[PDB]
Amino acid sequence: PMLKNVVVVGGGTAGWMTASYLTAAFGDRIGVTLVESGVGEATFSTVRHFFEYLGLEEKEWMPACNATYKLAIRFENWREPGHHFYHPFERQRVVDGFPLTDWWLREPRSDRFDKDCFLVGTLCDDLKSPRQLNGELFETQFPYAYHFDATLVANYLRDYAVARGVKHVLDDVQDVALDDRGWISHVVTGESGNLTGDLFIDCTGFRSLLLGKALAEPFQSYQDSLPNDSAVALRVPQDGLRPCTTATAQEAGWIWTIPLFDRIGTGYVYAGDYISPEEAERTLRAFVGPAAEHADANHIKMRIGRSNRHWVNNCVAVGLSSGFVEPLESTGIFFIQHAIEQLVKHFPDERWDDGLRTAYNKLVNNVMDGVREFLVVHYYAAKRQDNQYWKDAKTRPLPDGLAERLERWQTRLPDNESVFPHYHGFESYSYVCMLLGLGGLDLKSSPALGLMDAAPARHEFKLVGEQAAELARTLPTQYEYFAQLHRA
């Protein structure tokens, strides 16, 4: 009753995360074939579980992939010029039923909520490793992630999967053939014949050769709510070893800084209706400085949105073929991992229960729609309205339900029951952090706090300061930690 063969079309992170995960889940019990013809990438909290599922320890794969830790995103110039705050991978401290951020909002202890309420922002400022020299994490309350070279990770996972039995075909796909039912029959390669199988995984990127082209599945654009449709990127050496991604708001988008161990990936995500590619490139080069003078710039047109369905007949799209949003909250690898994890969970047998597709498609659509709402909030709640781009960010049509949630958030800070009510990766603490940092909404603390005992909250504020000072004195820098791993 089980399927016998999976064909993954396309390599990169999408294809080789799929192939490697299938071998960890199913072993030799099903055949996997991948057909395929450095970029710094950031990740989201759940990626720790992907490597754990494959049995890979950080000390094994991080050195081979130029990887560093990502404890937070540093948001620069979204509220006002010269202002920054951290969005940390750090879950809430709750005191007598109220988050510490609620207590802070009632009586702010400084200009920086992220300094008073969190530990991780200070760790980023001090270039800290999250692991001590003794190998232990400093602490989960800290669901951190990584920066890595996506090409090196793809090669690492390729070696992992091929060593465990994945068949690797190096060739171009010239055509996709459908049978009389409209299911994928086979893929025509340039010089290796036609590859057939039970299940086809479309990892062909924006081109979406199987799902979007051969099967002609409609694609739902997000461009009306999120206008950024383009990017220009370059790479420079490390001078920068800060354990966070930086997102610096610009006149028509934002610039990412993604620190690898000895390289920095940087790029300008922008809206082509507001600025030209050559002006985006000029801005990016000036931002990076003299190190970018001779670096080669890569220009990218983005397909922003999601497929209407992600599993159609015997085809499942994974990666940019399934959907994409700008990497403002580093969701690319997250979308891939969610798609693979849910594919294993909803894996079909030879009877191809249509209910599996229905559930799978709803889960993916809810993840992507929920992330879309979260990103819209980034531009809506950003206080800056200095030009037409940042004014328009407040007048675009909002996704269903968001207008009501925005009103709830200006009564009490976001919690589990006032955010997008389906799984979409991000937890309520991320909403609270972004709203406080972006500064554009009229937020209010809970009136009940004026009747509560303040001693527990005041104790917690003092503890955060004492712990941040202890960690500043004890933790090594990322460089010091990685130098110790190299010596070991």
Residue numbers in the entry: 0 to 36, 43 to 144, 162 to 261, 266 to 514
What do the study's own words say?
Flavin-dependent halogenases (FDHs) regioselectively halogenate aromatic substrates using halide ions, O2, and reduced flavin (FADH2) at physiological temperatures in aqueous solution, making them a green alternative to conventional synthetic methods for aryl halide preparation. To better understand mechanistic details that limit FDH catalytic efficiency and potentially hinder their application as in vitro biocatalysts, we investigated the halogenation activity, substrate scope, crystal structures, and ligand binding of the Trp-5-halogenase AbeH and the Trp-6-halogenase BorH. HOCl generation occurs >10 Å away from where the Trp (or other aromatic substrate) binds, and the HOCl must diffuse through a tunnel toward a conserved Lys,29 which either hydrogen bonds with HOCl and positions the Cl for reaction with Trp by EAS25,30,31 or reacts with HOCl to form a chloramine, which in turn transfers Cl to Trp by EAS. Our results show that flavin cosubstrate/coproduct (FADH2/FAD) and substrate (Trp) cannot bind simultaneously to either AbeH or BorH.
Apo-AbeH crystallized in P21 with four molecules in the ASU. There are four AbeH chains in the asymmetric unit, arranged as two dimers (B/D and A/C) with the same dimer interface seen in the AbeH/FAD structure but different crystal packing between the dimers. The monoclinic crystal used to solve the apo-AbeH structure had been soaked in Trp, but there was no electron density in the Trp binding site. The most significant backbone difference between the chains in the apo-AbeH structure and the AbeH/FAD structure is in the flavin binding loop, which is closed over FAD in both chains of the complex structure but is disordered in Chains A and B and in the open conformation in chains C and D in the apo-AbeH structure. In addition, the Gly10-Gly11 peptide bond is flipped, so that in apo-AbeH the Gly10 carbonyl O is hydrogen bonded to the NH of Gly14, and in AbeH/FAD, the Gly11 N–H is engaged in a water-mediated interaction with the FAD pyrophosphoryl group (a similar flip was previously observed between the open and closed conformations of Thal31). In the apo-AbeH structure, all four chains are missing the η3-β9 segment, chains A, C, and D are missing the segment between β16 and β17, and chains C and D are missing five additional residues at the C-terminus. The four apo-AbeH chains have Cα rmsd values ranging from 0.33–0.51 Å with one another and from 0.78–1.11 Å with chain B of the AbeH/FAD structure. In apo-AbeH, even though the flavin binding loop is open/disordered and Glu46 points inward, the gate is closed, and the lid is open. The closed gate explains our inability to soak Trp into this crystal form, but it is unclear why the gate remains closed even though the flavin binding loop is open.
